[PDB]
Design a protein around this nucleic acid. Structure first.
Ligand code: PAR
Ligand code: MG
Ligand code: MG
Ligand code: MG
Ligand code: MG
Ligand code: MG
Ligand code: MG
Lengths: 182, 127, 142, 59
RNA sequence: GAUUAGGGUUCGAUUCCGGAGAGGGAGCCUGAGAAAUAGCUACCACUUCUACGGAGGGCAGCAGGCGCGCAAAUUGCCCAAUGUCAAAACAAAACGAUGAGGCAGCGAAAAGAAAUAGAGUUUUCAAUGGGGGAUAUUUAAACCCAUCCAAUAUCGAGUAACAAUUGGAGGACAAGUCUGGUGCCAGCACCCGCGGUAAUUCCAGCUCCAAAAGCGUAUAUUA
């Protein structure tokens, strides 16, 4: 009862659950990025909505204000750090132009497809969740892992994975047992 | 993949000499690639004994480890005392019992609660 | 011709609004106690009751059927009400002297369309769910 | 008479429904692979009628 | 706290602070502090043991029990941590007490993360969980998670049967002029409306749509 650990909600369901324009865009986003459900889109809506709302508050504030120099250089920093904005985009008006496919390109499911470690985007989500990709010699099993810019150089196969330098996986190993009893 | 005997290397991060309580306290991280399972605390105890040159390998105290996700390494807290007689003095009973030497467990507390309520009625030498 | 300004006219505006909120049938129902003392459920939902008798309530024009519904007497306050039994069949799952779990249906106690004067609904009979008996997920005890 | 329905006629149509059984039909993929199956048919395999029915007695 | 452009409209028994109460109502003693209730005295309402002389009760403490209801868990393990008390550091024949408080069992209140497959030329190749288990690790002790199937030497997917559901398909509102049945009947339908022998609406089969380890419904309440 006396537990003060915090928790909040990360996604929000849309108003108007049957919009034929919206339902067609989100089925493209579930196909082009290999997503499980519409809720994984909807947290990328709320992630980007909160960036689009704070950056629109800071432009109400003048320049050489304390809450715009601090904390406006923080939101441009995390866009440059996670690959949301390339380094030319530094004016804070580019956060207001970010889209949901700009955030979905930074998921570990997408880079493992774009770096070339997997044939399809549904090949990438299997290999993450089946413990094959290490970001910095750290096995990451989360597909919604947002990859930073500095982490792109070091994505490879895991050192414990059978595809890397680890022991052979199940279908070879249970076949290597069946050839052993004979 | 190339098969080799699984090697444990051991590292101490933030070290501190505690002149109070007569000990050296630190956190110790163990890297164990190609290992099968988790490294036992007893095997970390002898390898941390050689790295600090302690005269008796059982005066090292190593409690709770947390294996890192993905494998490859653990990290826990470490304690090395100046004396083994100082170990039996300042360690808790539960870490002593995990090292073998320690006091055997008391009777279950529900029993000593009921007997003490029965003695609240009595007065003489009976209780 | 409507309202008053004036920088010191707030007591007039506070009194003016508190009387005109009583004309709001949502504000007046949320702030008077005839709302719950006459509600057959005690200002709550899903009240239990005992089935007394089966009624066939004929539908309103332009429809024409008879709606299969039971009259139940609630346990929490002993109020007799008539409640509808939803689905094809389903008075075959209700006998007299059965405990039934009765919710409202729809419109906050305002008699969903065809059925005249019935504003409650059977949810669960003999502590097993009535829609589970229809789809034959499970069957009645005893 | 005035009323043509009775409480005795309860469950008339559901009793005389002819009771067809469902067929075998191997399972569809679940979860992320079912969204892959939705996407490939409505986009990659080219008004757009999502459930076009074969011609019946209306023409 | 919920919702909110702005102005607001609501909820706050509930973890922190304060106030009040210990079955109702009094009155006290002792103490630095009580009008104390795991203190006392009395009455009222219930109430337990009796060898009939008498003697006791107070769970709005923690587990539980019966009722009451639409509606809420274990008569669990422990002081290891957080603290409190105190004649009191720990250790040595030689472990202070703690239903405070932790810990675990139940637990779809509500929240995070996430499987139910991938890849290729009918036909194969790789995967790794769910799950079984340890030299062990966690833990006060277990549990969980984490790590692991040799380090000389560790089990395992194919219908991967290890099988996704809940509500819909006239309109709003996304998705059938399909087939069978019934014939203002049975039922559906929040609202508009369906059903009167060719039912886009009922009962079903198929096929689709929506959200998905969730999804209906009811009553409050904000937009
Ligand atoms: N007339 C009866 C109506 O029923 C409602 O009752 C409930 C439902 O009918 C309704 O459920 C709706 C569902 O119909 C609709 N198809 C989609 C919507 N997401 C659901 O909403 C519900 O489910 C979501 C889960 O995503 C919950 O997060 C959400 O809080 C909850 N309201 O949400 C309500 C919560 O149980 C209203 N309570 C009631 O005031 C209203 O009058
Ligand atoms: Mg592995
Ligand atoms: Mg308080
Ligand atoms: Mg009285
Ligand atoms: Mg209790
Ligand atoms: Mg027809
Ligand atoms: Mg149908």
């Amino acid at each position: 009862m006396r537990n003060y650990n915090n928790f909040n909600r990360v996604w929000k369901a849309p108003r108007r659950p049957f919009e034929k324009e919206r339902l067609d865009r989100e089925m493209k986003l579930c196909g082009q990025y290999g997503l499980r459900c519409k809720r994984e889109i909807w947290r990328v809506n709320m992630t980007l909505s909160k960036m689009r709302r704070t950056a629109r508050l800071l432009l109400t504030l003048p320049e050489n204000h304390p809450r715009r120099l601090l904390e406006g250089s923080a939101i441009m920093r995390r866009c440059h750090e996670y690959g949301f904005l390339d380094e030319e985009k530094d004016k804070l008006d580019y956060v207001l132009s970010l889209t949901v496919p700009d955030i979905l390109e930074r998921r570990l499911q997408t880079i493992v497809f774009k770096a070339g470690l997997a044939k399809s985007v549904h090949h990438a989500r299997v290999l993450i969740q089946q413990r094959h990709i290490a970001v910095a010699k750290q096995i990451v099993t989360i597909p919604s892992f947002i990859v930073r810019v500095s982490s792109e150089r070091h994505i490879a196969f895991a050192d414990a994975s059978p595809f890397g330098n680890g022991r052979p996986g199940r279908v070879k190993r249970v076949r290597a047992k069946a050839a052993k009893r004979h | 993949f190339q098969k080799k005997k699984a090697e444990v290397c051991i590292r101490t991060s933030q070290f501190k000499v505690n002149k109070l309580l007569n000990r050296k306290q630190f956190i110790v991280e163990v890297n164990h690639p190609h290992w099968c399972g988790t490294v036992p605390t007893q095997l970390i105890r002898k390898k941390l004994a050689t790295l600090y040159k302690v005269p008796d390998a059982s005066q090292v105290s190593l409690f709770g480890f947390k294996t890192k996700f993905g494998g490859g390494k653990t990290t826990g807290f470490g304690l090395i005392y100046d004396d083994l007689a100082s170990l039996k003095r300042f360690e808790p009973n539960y870490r002593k019992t995990r090292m073998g030497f320690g006091k055997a467990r008391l009777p279950a507390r529900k029993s000593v609660k009921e007997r003490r309520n029965r003695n609240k009625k009595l007065r003489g030498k009976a209780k | 011709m409507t309202k008053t300004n004036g920088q010191n006219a707030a007591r007039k505006l506070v009194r003016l609004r508190r009387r005109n909120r009583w004309a709001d049938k949502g504000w007046k129902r949320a702030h008077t106690f005839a709302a719950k003392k006459a509600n057959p459920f005690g200002g709550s939902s899903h009240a239990k009751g005992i089935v007394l008798e089966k009624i066939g309530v004929g539908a309103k024009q332009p429809n024409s059927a008879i709606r299969k519904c039971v009259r139940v007497q609630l346990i929490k306050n002993d109020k007799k009400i008539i409640a509808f039994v939803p689905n094809d069949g389903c008075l075959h799952f209700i006998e007299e002297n059965d405990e039934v779990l009765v919710s409202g249906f729809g419109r906050s106690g305002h008699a969903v369309g065809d059925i005249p004067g019935v504003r409650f609904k059977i949810v669960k009979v003999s502590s097993v769910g009535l829609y589970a008996l229809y789809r034959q997920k499970k069957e009645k005890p005893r | 008479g005035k009323i043509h329905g009775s409480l005795a006629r309860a469950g008339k149509v559901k009793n005389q429904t002819p009771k067809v059984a469902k067929q075998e039909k191997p399972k569809q993929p679940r979860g992320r692979a079912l969204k892959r199956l939705k996407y490939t048919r409505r986009f990659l395999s080219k008004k757009v009628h999502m459930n076009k029915q074969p011609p019946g007695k209306a023409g």
